[PDB]
Amino acid sequence: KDPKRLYCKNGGFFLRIHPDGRVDGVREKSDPHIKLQLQAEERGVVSIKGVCANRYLAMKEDGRLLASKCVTDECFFFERLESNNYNTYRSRKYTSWYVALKRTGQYKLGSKTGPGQKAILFLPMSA
Template sequence: MSLSFLLLLLFSHLILSAWAHGETRPAPRGRPGPAAAGRNPGGSGGGGTASSSSSASASPAAPSGGRGGGSEQSSFQWSPSGRRTGSLYCRVGIGFHLQIYPDGKVNGSHEANVLSILEIFAVSQGIVGIRGVFSNKFLAMSKKGKLHASAKFTDDCKFRERFQENSYNTYASAIHRTEKTGREWYVALNKRGKAKRGCSPRVKPQHVSTHFLPRFKQSEQPELSFTVTVPEKKKPPDPIKPKVPLSVPRKSPNTVKYRLKFRFG
């Protein structure tokens, strides 16, 4: 009995010494030890406040390296309003689409292609600019009335857009015109698709060479409608037709019976 009691005392002494050794072990930096956390949960010292302030300061900086607003803003494509993308069709001759080349040449093509894709944007009230989407150059008219493509947008690239009675548009230079008469210079194509000089006396707003029809691809508007399922109408059963015999017996007429009377004597 005494031997077991001594073994129990020795085992308890070993457990107490091990627990005391673990409590006195120094805690790592930046993280409070178990004794400090148990004795002072409020943290009047600088450890608790420092850790909270460091975590608060580190949290806003975390999204900048991850999926932050910077990556979303870079992938977002801004679509400016007031810009129309399409082609300008001139009905002169067999019909031509105005096209702008990267080398500065301007003419017309019967078939629409990438050079005829234009972007028309508003500059001011009634004044527009025309840019070739493929060539990335602006339609311009020089002082001599010649049409060409300009890499920079200047006053020569400004045109006055007017809607005609025949549903066609005309584009006149906003700054160049005949000084003596004040006649405006218009964008025009001849019957072979070549650009005409705006200062030519034959270029008039009444002529078909100056009439252009904007052909823009409109975005499809959502159809404001709804569908209703109509229950199918059940067809009434066909009435049973009486079977008609092939031969119908004739109705016999009313017969009259005569009785013979015999008289004797």
Template structure:
């Protein structure tokens, strides 16, 4: 009788030991997973410093670097500016500015250069004239680059670009490069951002 009671008392002790060993084994198996999942911020910063030794490793400096647009300055693109009125903007050899329906006209090839953030200069590659707008909103061309040749480039909601004169405004309102339904340039003071005649799609020149 005494032996039977002793064996019954030892049984729970053995079960507890077994459970304890099982929990220990489970903890050992899961510990590497927790170690891999937990990556301290300092280790990430160290990796950035290792791969980019010349860059600042602080989070604020990384944000400033990501939001910098300085790389856009000096960018040069060759495009054809296709108006929403179905004309390609062109500058002829005599300096005349107008639109053309011809898709492969050499005079419609423009060199768009970023002179500042969001500001560009448009130059005819074959005519060697710059696109310009004077105080009265007249679109013309010039051989010599000046403040009249600067345009604010903006991508509109419909995916087209608009080009507003950087220097001149009319009654506080911007004046835009625009081609009417006949392909002729519109006066800047008669243009608005919402007008389709002022919307251009830059097409890559192959």
């Protein structure tokens, strides 16, 4: 309900959604574009909206990330709860692929993600 920041355990980057739809991670907590709004769709399914960008994170058919102005089926992810309050987000459309960030803060392509990676674990935090 409240806004969130998703803190990636793989180097501690907050998942960031830019006004133009680019997706990446940054460490600066005061960054306005890491303020996200998670919305329940079905049980355990969420969309992830950049509040400032007013766009929905989308997993593309080639494993790229791009935030969409309009919701599509590419914008829904399974939220699975994991160890020490960390969540994973798996594309509903491309069911082997996760939202993920590299240790550099560049996001990790879905094709290269998988269970157990540090890259896919995000901790929701307050805003």
